[PDB]
Design a protein around this ligand. Structure first.
Ligand SMILES: N[C@H](C(=O)N1CCCC1)C1CCN(c2nccc3c(-c4ncc(Cl)cc4Cl)cccc23)CC1
Ligand SMILES: [Ca+2]
Length: 569
């Protein structure tokens, strides 16, 4: 609550006239310029004097002043210092104080409700987590347009004639200058004005500022912006302006957060089988639009006062937009809230594809995408191995669905051996002539006999196995949280993998209703074994399995109730 101020050096010769800012301790320099033994001090009834009624001239006397109420006029409040001694008659040092109030209120407590600066301890350092301090900013991503902006106010109670000899200046550091825009009740601090002179009148006067952030956190911007108020002494026309008081709030720009398959959906977008999508969406109770691809992704940015969705593209609604094969949002899945060896990741962890080691022929996601994901912190990315895939996307062999038990979810992984065992269970029963089914059909007896297909699917198993162990470690996962979806592959151009039949992990999870790509499996006794196997896997967790066909569609899911600012990266 109690902030630190300047030192006021009084002298027995002339009197001293200082200003003191309500909420700041002020130190008094009695020992300098004093003559010669002991000293008393008596002040005006609105000046609190802590010493640490008679005291000596030892230089170890911390004389500290604080003001009790803002002033009516200049030198409203007086302070007098005695410098008596044993044989010396008391010598007076005068000090005339002028109380003022200068407070920056802004939402530093992250409760939605703007609070004054003297309400935190360290107003100048932004800290994560609950019990933390630091106001939030939303990026622009594009009256009532104040809604997507932060509130910052200045409340000042000063004498009538105060700003004749003082002035207030609002200012932002030049390095943060191009990343913020501050409006007055009109742009004051901007991307080319690092400081602006407030015209404030005497007396009591609250004036309001609106702050938007102009860019997201990144390797050239850790995400902090501090706006600072400075009180300037422009009295003595000869000498320059002397600062007498500075105070500031620190904003952190809200990062972009991504949503996992396990968040409740809100809207489905799409621009034939669109009937079967509308049907799934009807059953899941969720909105759906049509405009007459997965090169975008719909996240959200969140501050106490306003949450809104934002779309990133590598026009549509979603009130906000921002703009090799591995560089696609198909190569970005987001885990559910998890805790690994005690560390909580309550907004998930972002999984993206990559090679295992860099070579000539190895691909990687562009370094500036990886660095931007990482720069948001809140969802500590996790590099995976997917370069073995023709396309390269993580979405090609993993997905998450909601479960009512264990950790509340399951990780689906594609599994060639899961499919082989099913086909072998089928052939062992005399169904090797069951034809599977991008056209040439094959009976399962041929497919299991294909020794080459066996090697591809063994190697592919080793790839997905490698990633399995990665997910286990980086997501603190127990096998009991993993469900292997039978799925075949084939190695095509440049010995990269391709989904043998429709990639069933690449599914639409709309709450508990799954739209799964129809594999066109071998029909055994009027029931496709592959569908039957996947229902058998997912229905115990109470998912509703529906098999479709095959631009695509996207999904906007409800943001986490957990507020990113309470995590501690
Ligand atoms: N200064 C700008 C800013 O903050 N603005 C612009 C005006 C509004 C606010 C930054 C925006 C973010 N921007 C990006 N940096 C990395 C990646 C990006 C991706 C992406 N593309 C593909 C994948 Cl798979 C993953 C990702 Cl995140 C999409 C879209 C933008 C991106 C860096 C410049
Ligand atoms: Ca994805």
């Amino acid at each position: 609550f109690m902030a630190q101020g300047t030192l006021i050096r009084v002298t027995p010769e002339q009197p001293t006239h200082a200003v003191c800012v309500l909420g700041t301790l002020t130190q008094l320099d009695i020992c300098s310029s004093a003559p010669e033994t002991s000293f008393s001090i008596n002040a005006s009834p609105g000046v609190v004097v802590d010493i640490a009624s008679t005291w000596p001239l030892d230089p170890g006397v911390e004389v500290t002043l604080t003001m009790k109420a803002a002033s009516g006029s200049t030198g409203d409040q007086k302070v007098q210092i005695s410098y008596y001694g044993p044989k010396t008659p008391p010598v007076k040092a005068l000090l005339y104080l002028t109380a003022v109030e200068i407070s920056l209120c802004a939402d530093i407590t992250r409760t939605g409700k703007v609070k004054p600066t003297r309400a935190v301890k360290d107003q100048r350092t932004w800290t994560w987590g609950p019990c933390g301090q630091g106001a939030i900013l939303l990026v622009n991503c594009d009256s009532e347009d104040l809604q997507d902006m932060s509130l910052m106010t200045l409340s000042t109670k000063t004498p009538k004639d105060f700003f004749t000899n003082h002035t207030l200046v609002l200012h932002v550091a030049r390095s943060e200058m191009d990343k913020v825009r501050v409006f007055q009740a009109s742009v004051v601090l901007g991307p080319k004005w690092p400081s602006h002179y407030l015209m404030v009148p005497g007396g009591k006067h609250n004036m309001d500022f609106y702050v938007e952030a102009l860019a997201f956190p990144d390797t050239d911007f850790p995400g902090l912006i501090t706006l600072t108020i400075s009180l300037l002494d422009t009295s003595n026309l000869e000498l320059p302006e002397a600062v007498v008081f500075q105070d500031s709030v620190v904003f952190r720009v809200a990062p972009w957060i991504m949503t996992p398959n396990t968040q409740p959906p809100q809207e489905v977008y799409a621009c034939d089988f669109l009937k079967s999508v509308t049907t799934l969406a009807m059953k899941a109770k969720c909105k759906l639009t049509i405009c007459p691809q997965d090169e975008m992704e719909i996240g959200y940015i969140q501050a106490p006062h306003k949450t809104l969705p934002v779309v990133f593209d590598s026009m549509g609604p979603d009130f906000g937009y921002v703009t090799s094969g591995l560089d696609s949002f198909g190569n970005l899945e987001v885990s559910p809230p998890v805790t690994v060896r005690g560390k909580e990741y309550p907004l998930g962890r972002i999984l993206f594809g990559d090679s295992c080691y860099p070579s000539n022929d190895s691909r990687q996601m562009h370094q500036a995408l990886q660095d931007f994901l990482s720069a948001q912190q809140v969802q500590a990315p996790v590099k995976l191995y997917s370069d073995w895939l023709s396309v390269g996307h993580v979405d090609e062999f993993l997905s998450f669905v909601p479960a009512p038990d264990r950790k509340g979810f399951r990780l689906l992984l594609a599994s060639p051996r899961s499919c082989y065992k099913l086909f072998q269970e089928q052939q062992n029963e005399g169904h090797g002539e069951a034809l599977l089914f991008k056209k040439k059909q094959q009976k399962i007896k041929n497919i299991l006999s294909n020794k080459t297909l066996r090697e591809h699917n063994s190697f592919v198993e080793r790839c997905i196995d490698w990633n399995r162990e990665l997910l286990k470690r980086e997501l603190g996962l127990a096998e009991s949280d993993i469900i292997d979806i039978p799925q075949l592959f084939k190695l095509k151009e440049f010995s990269k993998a391709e989904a043998f039949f429709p990639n069933m992990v690449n599914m639409l999870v709309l709450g508990k209703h799954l739209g799964i790509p129809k594999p066109f499996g071998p029909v055994i006794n009027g029931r496709c074994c592959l569908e039957e196997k996947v229902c058998s896997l997912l229905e115990p967790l109470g998912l509703q399995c529906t098999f479709i066909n095959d631009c695509g569609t996207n999904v906007r899911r409800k943001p986490f109730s957990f507020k990113w600012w309470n995590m501690v990266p």
